[PDB]
Amino acid sequence: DFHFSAIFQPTDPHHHQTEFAKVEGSEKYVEEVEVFGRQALKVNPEALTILAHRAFSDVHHFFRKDHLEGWRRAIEDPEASDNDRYVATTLLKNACIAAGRVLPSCQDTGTAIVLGKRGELCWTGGEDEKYLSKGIWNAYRYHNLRYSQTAALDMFKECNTGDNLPAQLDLLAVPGSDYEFLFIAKGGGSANKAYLYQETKALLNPKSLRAFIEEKLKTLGTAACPPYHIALVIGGTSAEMTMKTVKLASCRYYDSLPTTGDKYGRAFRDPEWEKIVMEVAQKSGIGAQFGGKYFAHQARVIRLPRHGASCPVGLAVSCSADRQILAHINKSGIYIEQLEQNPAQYLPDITTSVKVDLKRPIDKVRQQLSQYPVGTRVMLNGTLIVARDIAHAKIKEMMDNGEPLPEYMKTSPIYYAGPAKTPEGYASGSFGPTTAGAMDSYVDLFQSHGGSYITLAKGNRSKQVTDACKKHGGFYLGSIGGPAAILAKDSIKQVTCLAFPELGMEAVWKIEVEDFPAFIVVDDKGNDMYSKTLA
Amino acid sequence: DFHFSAIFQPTDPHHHQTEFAKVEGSEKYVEEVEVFGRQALKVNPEALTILAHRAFSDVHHFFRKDHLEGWRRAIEDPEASDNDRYVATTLLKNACIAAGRVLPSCQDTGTAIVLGKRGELCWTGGEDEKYLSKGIWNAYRYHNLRYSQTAALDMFKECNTGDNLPAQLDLLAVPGSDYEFLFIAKGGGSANKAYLYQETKALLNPKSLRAFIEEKLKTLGTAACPPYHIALVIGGTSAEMTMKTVKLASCRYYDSLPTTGDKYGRAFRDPEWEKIVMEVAQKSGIGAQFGGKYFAHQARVIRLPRHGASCPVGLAVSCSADRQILAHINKSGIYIEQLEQNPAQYLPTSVKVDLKRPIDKVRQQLSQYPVGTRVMLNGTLIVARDIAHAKIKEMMDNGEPLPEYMKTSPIYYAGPAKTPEGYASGSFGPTTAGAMDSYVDLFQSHGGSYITLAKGNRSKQVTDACKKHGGFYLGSIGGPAAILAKDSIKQVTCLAFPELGMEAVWKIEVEDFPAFIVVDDKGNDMYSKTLA
Numbered sequence A: 001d002f003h004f005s006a007i008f009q010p011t012d013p014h015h016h017q018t019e020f021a022k023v024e025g026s027e028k029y030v031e032e033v034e035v036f037g038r039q040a041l042k043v044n045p046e047a048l049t050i051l052a053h054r055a056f057s058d059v060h061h062f063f064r065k066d067h068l069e070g071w072r073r074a075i076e077d078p079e080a081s082d083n084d085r086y087v088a089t090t091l092l093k094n095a096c097i098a099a100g101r102v103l104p105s106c107q108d109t110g111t112a113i114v115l116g117k118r119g120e121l122c123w124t125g126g127e128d129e130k131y132l133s134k135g136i137w138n139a140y141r142y143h144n145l146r147y148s149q150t151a152a153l154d155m156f157k158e159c160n161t162g163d164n165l166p167a168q169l170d171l172l173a174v175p176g177s178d179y180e181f182l183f184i185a186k187g188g189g190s191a192n193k194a195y196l197y198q199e200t201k202a203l204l205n206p207k208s209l210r211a212f213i214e215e216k217l218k219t220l221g222t223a224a225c226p227p228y229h230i231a232l233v234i235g236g237t238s239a240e241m242t243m244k245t246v247k248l249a250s251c252r253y254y255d256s257l258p259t260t261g262d263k264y265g266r267a268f269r270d271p272e273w274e275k276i277v278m279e280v281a282q283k284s285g286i287g288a289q290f291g292g293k294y295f296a297h298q299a300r301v302i303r304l305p306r307h308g309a310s311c312p313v314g315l316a317v318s319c320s321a322d323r324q325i326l327a328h329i330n331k332s333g334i335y336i337e338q339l340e341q342n343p344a345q346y347l348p349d350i351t352t353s354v355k356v357d358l359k360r361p362i363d364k365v366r367q368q369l370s371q372y373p374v375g376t377r378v379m380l381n382g383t384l385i386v387a388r389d390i391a392h393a394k395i396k397e398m399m400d401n402g403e404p405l406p407e408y409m410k411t412s413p414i415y416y417a418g419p420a421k422t423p424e425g426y427a428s429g430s431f432g433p434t435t436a437g438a439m440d441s442y443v444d445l446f447q448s449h450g451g452s453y454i455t456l457a458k459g460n461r462s463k464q465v466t467d468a469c470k471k472h473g474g475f476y477l478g479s480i481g482g483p484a485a486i487l488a489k490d491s492i493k494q495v496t497c498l499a500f501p502e503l504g505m506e507a508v509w510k511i512e513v514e515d516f517p518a519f520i521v522v523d524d525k526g527n528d529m530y531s532k533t534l535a
Numbered sequence B: 001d002f003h004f005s006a007i008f009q010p011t012d013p014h015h016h017q018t019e020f021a022k023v024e025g026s027e028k029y030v031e032e033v034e035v036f037g038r039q040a041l042k043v044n045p046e047a048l049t050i051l052a053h054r055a056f057s058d059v060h061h062f063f064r065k066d067h068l069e070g071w072r073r074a075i076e077d078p079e080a081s082d083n084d085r086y087v088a089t090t091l092l093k094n095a096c097i098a099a100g101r102v103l104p105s106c107q108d109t110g111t112a113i114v115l116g117k118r119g120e121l122c123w124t125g126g127e128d129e130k131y132l133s134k135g136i137w138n139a140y141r142y143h144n145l146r147y148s149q150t151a152a153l154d155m156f157k158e159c160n161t162g163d164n165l166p167a168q169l170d171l172l173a174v175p176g177s178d179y180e181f182l183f184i185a186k187g188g189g190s191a192n193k194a195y196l197y198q199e200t201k202a203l204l205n206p207k208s209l210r211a212f213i214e215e216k217l218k219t220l221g222t223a224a225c226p227p228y229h230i231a232l233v234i235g236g237t238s239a240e241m242t243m244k245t246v247k248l249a250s251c252r253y254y255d256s257l258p259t260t261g262d263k264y265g266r267a268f269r270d271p272e273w274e275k276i277v278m279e280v281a282q283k284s285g286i287g288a289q290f291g292g293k294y295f296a297h298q299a300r301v302i303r304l305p306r307h308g309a310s311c312p313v314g315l316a317v318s319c320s321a322d323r324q325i326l327a328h329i330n331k332s333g334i335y336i337e338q339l340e341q342n343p344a345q346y347l348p349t350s351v352k353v354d355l356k357r358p359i360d361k362v363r364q365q366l367s368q369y370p371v372g373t374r375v376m377l378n379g380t381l382i383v384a385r386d387i388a389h390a391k392i393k394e395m396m397d398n399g400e401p402l403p404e405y406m407k408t409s410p411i412y413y414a415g416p417a418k419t420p421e422g423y424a425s426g427s428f429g430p431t432t433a434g435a436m437d438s439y440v441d442l443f444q445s446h447g448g449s450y451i452t453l454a455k456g457n458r459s460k461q462v463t464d465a466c467k468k469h470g471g472f473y474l475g476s477i478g479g480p481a482a483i484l485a486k487d488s489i490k491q492v493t494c495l496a497f498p499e500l501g502m503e504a505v506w507k508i509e510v511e512d513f514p515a516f517i518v519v520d521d522k523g524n525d526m527y528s529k530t531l532a
């Protein structure tokens, strides 16, 4: 009566539906042998370095077709809002810049994640983690990417690792003699929008599940640069298994799963509820960051088995920096997924913004902004003072010790961002905004001390920021989230380090910008352009 | 220059600190060979079946020393409350029964989880998941365990798989030629108390982190049968990595990690903050289920690297059914962690309630006492949990009456393990009450569920319901499923929905069934102070 049933039964387990390119000459890294009557493959571990290096280079300059098609859909759909089309056009133009292979598509070049599946008879010498890490190290060291990993010297003392290591290296033991991979360059903002819910059987009916989906999708907000690939996993054998599944679902790794369950508890994709997720996302009005229909590119819904007493649920997104790449090593060499190298083909063949001069007293800038309602698009020209999470924490710590808010926090709008490395001969590397919500706890304090009256970042913010701006006559401006390469190429004209150089990308910078687009998200009157869609 | 640094650098990666017994004759399943100048191991895959079968049999009848030592500490501590000692004594006596190898220590024999680490040159034939699953199937089929896995035929239509499969099989590729394992029989209740938080740099200071810990520990409540092994993971490279780490930390799998960080971002255990967690747990007053000092056995705190923009945080517990077993296969055969087979060495006022009356008489008697009163129940209980409640709500939504069996007796939220031959009942302890909270006001408004019996603190809607309708919630001790079956449960009958397996509605006759009045008919809740 025993019947083994693997939980995951893809019809395309080796991803034949994906197009791959062979690394030229790479068959020299492999050798077919036979031991004890079984076919095995000897792999020079240098192949893992070569592969990881190319993967974490390619993925920062090109996108998959299904991602690019989503931006085109947002441009061509009559039901898309004007802001939907504007945002998607900006992201497509950014992708065209990134395809130049100099600037990465986002300043957050992400955490390096490797899902590896090493066959029983695939023999590497066993030092896979080191050789993969050397390839990741190469990609981030010798290209214009960013070192984003923060080491803990103790519970609270931190430093940047300076090389974007350590990677997340999940190497699985599987049948056969090949080595198969999914590489992910996972941005922090979308990683933060991976949520775990501990639910019950009471959720598992159509009315409760739809209400749940409507409630939770809003908590994603715009803080991870939509349009999103939305992934929803219902059930699972443990919290960690649910969350791993929702990550992989968001990378479209489970697209070939069956679409029906069985009495053995196999996983399945649920197209009916994917359509419902898309309807909820579209009808939400949240839109592609600034109101409209294109909150989501597409949706993936996986139903999993569960312990009778349990119902873990996972919700996660892939952001505008949608970065994954499949690969495999076999008897013919190294193969790597082919991404779209001509994103410009997705762009169409075919008095809308307020010019804001920042080279004025900051009180003059506040006065001009006060004339306009939330949702007004502005174009910024002048100096921004750049500071995000660690710089804000350090400045608050100084003030807690009796020191004043530094003067450089009062002269210019505060841009929450951390730049990638500067290409030779460029004024700036990729330099888009970080998530605004992480700085929310500092706004009222800083404004009470005469600074941070105007902030510039991306994402909806908490009510304390709306209240602070109303109390102190402040504003929060929402940059487009994601278009870091076109901002650097076209808008950022000069970058200088002003304070805290030891923080790396998290130092305080003074930058000069031109034609920098943003929306007035929070005004000085209690208004918030997300108050209706994210209520 | 490039310097590779593994995130996890245990000083005891092969768990030499654990004692193992070799399965007799198991050297016949392995053969050491030498291929292209390197040492390799041929493993007959039947070894995986034998090993998984023994692991998921042993683990339901014995515990680790550090778990048992915690129960003794709660009994012997002068600062423990009377309820601390009562619960810990009950759990130890339950372990003594489970050590007889007939009744499992808990009715929830858990989800079968396998963490496997197969060396590059360990050759099994590659069908590891099937052979491991067959061993798990054997353990749950041929022993007095429970089938707890619920398959989704579609998004909402469900059925029990009838064999406790599928298992969670996480098989990793590692260096060498051995095969190393951690087997976990993970209860649903403690699995439900694995939480993920998305935090920021604003958390990473002593004042904010301590307040955060105090806040989140309370949300564990008593719903996963404390004393807890509490695990806290600060940071991580992804949510799933943070949650896998906190699971393993709760199994004491990472006990040998370094205790200092470095500029390469290595993981470390933080003993200073483990002590702070234990201090918060003790000062909370939550206690071993019913108030006191022994909310927690011990604590593990692991600090992980993080993306600059991110700070995932994981919190998870191991419950009273603390069930994990390390194992490895090498050139000498199959080795399995030795658990404590003589738990008895760790061992050193109530109101009689007759249920064989009209339920209004039982409600009247219970109304005479405050919350915190210990009661002993004698008579019929009607047993129903998650799916049965959902089916009954659906019936009433379709105009049908609340069934008679929800109106005659206290409702025991439980699902039994299989009955041993010649026994009146298999292991039969309570399930978590909170999952049924959304039904209480509805059912009471329709004349039933006035008295419920389970374990764990409940939400305010249940307190309001019991005050509005004159109801009560009784808290059984959580965990002691074998001694409850041996001593209290005299007759078991399937009443309705037999297709639900353990989740069917049961009618059972009990004697000397202990419980506390947790919620009364007046708005009181014995957790209102500690879990506010």
Ligand code: SF4
Binding pocket: A106, A107, A108, A186, A187, A188, A189, A190, A223, A224, A225, A319, A320, A321, A432, A433, A434, A481, A482
């Ligand atoms: S800034 Fe936006 S697009 Fe870039 S990694 Fe973060 S969430 Fe993704």
Ligand code: SF4
Binding pocket: B106, B107, B108, B186, B187, B188, B189, B190, B223, B224, B225, B319, B320, B321, B429, B430, B431, B478, B479
């Ligand atoms: S009933 Fe309690 S002891 Fe048993 S598995 Fe659930 S939480 Fe653990």
